[PDB]
Symmetry: none
Subunit: 227 residues, 2 copies
């Protein structure tokens, strides 16, 4: 209020294929020249098929600052269909993962009435997709293309966040992301997994415990609720 | 989709590669260019014919501001509007100075409007006879209207540099769009209006609920 936005923290790079221009918050600058090289190597293979999300939305999460992030909530790749470029986001609130996440937070907070939930509007949380695209309707089908980019980006995230929360024990097998320093990590169940309500609920609960051990402020998960 | 297409024309450069966002005007452009090309290629041009249309390789879907000068540099035009690889041309140095004064960037070696997210720099006429500004208005006439009309369907703000340069252009758009006609970058003693004309583009974008331009993305260090 009073200051006119001028995007002073937003940089951009050119790449050889769609989306041709990647814009990104300054906090990502240390990895972008490597990302450009990797993406130019592989973009041809990626763009052959219809993807979730569309190529113009591959990189929009890089607009998010990292210096104000203390939790990363990470799934393996986008929704097989209707990915928006924002991890876990479902505008019409139909995808099973974000509905299950909302139910968990509802049980943890006591919030009963809501119409949606979005991990991307929570102070201190960056929601993340390890792989930034999938072939339309086929989960993890673009693992081989994103491989080195995914390691690069996750490694950069874990230099900023205090807690990394991975969703899907099977999904995150063998990713080999070489982190530079060990970071507090929880590998929990997939949000759409069956019969593990208690452990899904409790996985979110422990994150704030872990943050306080690190002398970091808790997450207010209720900020994600859409009314 | 988002990819490159191609069309053939009867004269040099014989083939025009373009981003698919331009597809709706390409058959009309071919017809128009074949009509005029012979008269056009008689003279040495800026840029060379192989670079007439390379700016059509830009997407429009990710563009919200068009910065538009009337035609290419009298000499050394690259096909990228305003671009000067050795940073010698007056207009881009003046633009760079404005942006330097707006943003506070002190040290830089160059500036390019073509590397800024959301900006498509543009030349109304895509060529001039070598050494003579506006020499090819007659040839580009209908094409220039066709392309600018198409650009303003995508961008939210159109910024034309040169009040006299753009007098009687008559390019008449299908639907009005937010436009600003400022002074030529090399104009004398109008630093405050030149600096301010860039500043208010972000104000206008905010009104349209569009993301601001970071003009500092143009600097080359």
């Amino acid at each position: 209020s009073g200051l006119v936005p001028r995007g002073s923290h937003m940089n951009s790079v050119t790449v050889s294929h769609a989306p041709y221009t990647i814009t990104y918050h300054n906090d990502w600058e240390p990895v972008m020249s490597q990302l450009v090289e990797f993406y130019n190597e592989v973009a041809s293979w990626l763009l052959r098929d219809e993807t979730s999300p569309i190529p113009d939305k591959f990189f929009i999460q890089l607009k998010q600052p990292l210096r104000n992030k203390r939790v990363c909530v990470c799934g393996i790749d986008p929704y097989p269909k209707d990915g928006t470029g924002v991890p876990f986001e479902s505008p019409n609130f139909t995808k099973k993962s974000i509905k299950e996440i909302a139910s968990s937070i509802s049980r943890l907070t006591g919030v009963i009435d809501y119409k949606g939930y979005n991990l991307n509007i929570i102070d201190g949380v960056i929601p993340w997709n390890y792989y930034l695209s999938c072939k339309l309707g086929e989960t993890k089908s673009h693992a081989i293309y994103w491989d080195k980019i995914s390691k690069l980006l996750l490694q950069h995230i874990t230099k900023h966040v205090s807690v990394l929360y991975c969703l899907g024990k099977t999904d995150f097998s063998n990713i080999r992301a070489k982190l530079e320093s060990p970071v507090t990590t929880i590998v929990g169940y997939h949000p759409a997994a069956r019969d593990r309500q208690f452990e899904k609920d409790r996985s979110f609960e422990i994150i704030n415990v872990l943050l306080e051990l690190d002398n970091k402020a808790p997450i207010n998960w209720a900020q994600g609720f859409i009314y």
